[PDB]
Design a protein around this ligand. Sequence first.
Ligand SMILES: Nc1ccn([C@@H]2O[C@H](CO)[C@@H](O)[C@H]2OP(=O)(O)O)c(=O)n1
Length: 124
Amino acid sequence: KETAAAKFERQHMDSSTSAASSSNYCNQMMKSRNLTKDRCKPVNTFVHESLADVQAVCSQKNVACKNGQTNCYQSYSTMSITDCRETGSSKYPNCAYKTTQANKHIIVACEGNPYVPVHFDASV
Ligand SMILES: Nc1ccn([C@@H]2O[C@H](CO)[C@@H](O)[C@H]2OP(=O)(O)O)c(=O)n1
């Protein structure tokens, strides 16, 4: 059954693109990654980097998570990210997202062995 580490890949990794190509990016990715299966997930970040480089974050700058846990790590460098946010016209099963492209540091929580990301905490 899906692992938290496979689930982070599915929801958050798009190594296949450098950046989101059009205003549609979010709509199609949210749908194709099955993030809008039971309802419209309202925020979701995709990261346009190699999996190894996002796994490395687990050994970068250790920081508190937004919720106060201390297994959160912030990337030493900025990454190319797409921010996806639900719009006023979103309506399940027709979930609708704003596509914002950015270059920011990313903060994830890590677990397990190998010690890998399993939640996207924030971009900064
Ligand atoms: N900038 C952000 C903020 C939040 N999240 C996702 O939105 C969720 C609820 O706020 C977070 O938990 C995270 O999901 P996940 O934990 O599945 O990585 C995200 O992807 N990007």
